Amino acid sequence: XLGAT
């Protein structure tokens, strides 16, 4: 989650 999480 490259920032996605």
For the chain, how long is the longest CA-to-CA vector? 7
CA 1 to chain centre: 3
CA pair distance 3, 5, nearest whole angstrom: 5
Which letter does DSSP use for residue 1 in this model? -
Residues in the chain: 5
Question: Encoding tokens for residue 2?
Answer: 């490259």
Amino acid at 2: L
Which residue carries 């920032």 as its tokens? 3
